[PDB]
Design a protein around this ligand. Sequence first.
Ligand SMILES: Nc1ccn([C@@H]2O[C@H](COP(=O)(O)OP(=O)(O)OP(=O)(O)O)[C@@H](O)[C@H]2O)c(=O)n1
Ligand SMILES: Nc1ccn([C@@H]2O[C@H](COP(=O)(O)OP(=O)(O)OP(=O)(O)O)[C@@H](O)[C@H]2O)c(=O)n1
Ligand SMILES: [Ca+2]
Ligand SMILES: [Ca+2]
Ligand SMILES: [Mg+2]
Ligand SMILES: [Mg+2]
Lengths: 225, 225
Amino acid sequence: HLDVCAVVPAAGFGRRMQTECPKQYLSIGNQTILEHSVHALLAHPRVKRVVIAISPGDSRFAQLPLANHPQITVVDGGDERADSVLAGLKAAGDAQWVLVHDAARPCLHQDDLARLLALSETSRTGGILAAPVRDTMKRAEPGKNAIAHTVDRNGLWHALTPQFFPRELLHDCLTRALNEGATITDEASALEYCGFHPQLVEGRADNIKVTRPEDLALAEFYLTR
Amino acid sequence: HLDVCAVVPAAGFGRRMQTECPKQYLSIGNQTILEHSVHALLAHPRVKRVVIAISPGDSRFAQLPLANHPQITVVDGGDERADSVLAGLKAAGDAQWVLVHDAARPCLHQDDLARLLALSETSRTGGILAAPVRDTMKRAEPGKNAIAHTVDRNGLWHALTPQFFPRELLHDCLTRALNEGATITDEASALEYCGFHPQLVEGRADNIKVTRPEDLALAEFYLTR
Ligand SMILES: Nc1ccn([C@@H]2O[C@H](COP(=O)(O)OP(=O)(O)OP(=O)(O)O)[C@@H](O)[C@H]2O)c(=O)n1
Ligand SMILES: Nc1ccn([C@@H]2O[C@H](COP(=O)(O)OP(=O)(O)OP(=O)(O)O)[C@@H](O)[C@H]2O)c(=O)n1
Ligand SMILES: [Ca+2]
Ligand SMILES: [Ca+2]
Ligand SMILES: [Mg+2]
Ligand SMILES: [Mg+2]
């Protein structure tokens, strides 16, 4: 019952990084962002497998140690993140629960990961790591850079990953959301579309996603310095 | 017309920092957070004066170089931030426009500051530095840590400081908001309460507010390393 399979969508190109090299293959130390991410998942004993979805043609993955790891399986991802997650879910085996984690979030801590996994003993829907909103938030007027009003930040959260859900429920919700042309952001949004309400497990705010050039040095700082 | 007076509320105790020393008096390099903040404002030629509101009894301010600076005036702040800003606005002289900046945001860049000041030539309401929301945001169900739904991040912004407004309009709006018992967060929220819609001037996301222990090292990283 405690066996978990992780799915890491890593089929993007990181166009917002300026590098011709996909960001997940940029390094911090001498390990790639993808490796930092994958190894944080493999550190928890319950993670028995990790399925990494890569772009077809991606010739870099094969040159990493992950390519020959007994607990790692690679599959081709798709056009959008949701497509890549589905492809990963297809190779997840018989795992009852799945952990979906962005290849671009290398700063994941073990304590957050462990608290997220505890959801399988107390939830039938699952949940996500999330950080509470700290800044005062403003909603802009439609099409203009003028403030319409302040958005109550009480009960407002930044969605992070991993996101942990029963495997087949996630597969079904992503499948339905996509087929009905729903607007999908993260895995939780697919459950949301189908009427579910995933749990919010508070996590560290330094669990950042490397998206822009400056993020590389910040991620490096968070890992240590 | 181009003369600006800045007001820096610095009368808080930074209880969330764990230090008995008020956070604005913690140092980065050999300059206090308050000094980094104040000096960033004084770097722009239009800032002719800075009024710093401190807690009564605050015995630290007097020991800093700012205490004898010809362009700096100190006043006693109040119970809440809005009270301290009002006290500062009272000593702002005849300045037509005022810049309100948190003592705890030492990472302000000159380019953002200059773009914010340009509002006086194109607005009668003023505006604030703000950073666009990047993460997918979730709204929690009332009183529970379960996701109600995803909040559209399009047109959603993190409010930062400085916040720049015509002096007397700001004074009047803060005065009314407080008298009517409105919920005030930043200076823009006071204008909002009175029917105004301040401008959003996009600024750097590394313009952070030192609030928790870990923020000190992050602020130090952003300044340089
Ligand atoms: N078709 C896609 C698109 C994205 N991803 C993965 O989704 C995670 C994070 O999404 P994001 O950073 O938003 O996408 P990128 O394509 O990596 O970056 P950009 O949007 O700047 O091109 C990344 O690990 C990325 O590789 C994926 O597997 N398949
Ligand atoms: N009565 C108050 C409360 C706050 N501030 C100032 O408001 C700015 C930022 O607000 P915040 O960080 O939220 O308040 P602090 O009191 O400094 O910290 P804490 O809430 O953890 O006690 C700080 O520069 C702080 O000194 C102030 O001048 N007067
Ligand atoms: Ca392991
Ligand atoms: Ca000057
Ligand atoms: Mg993308
Ligand atoms: Mg406070």
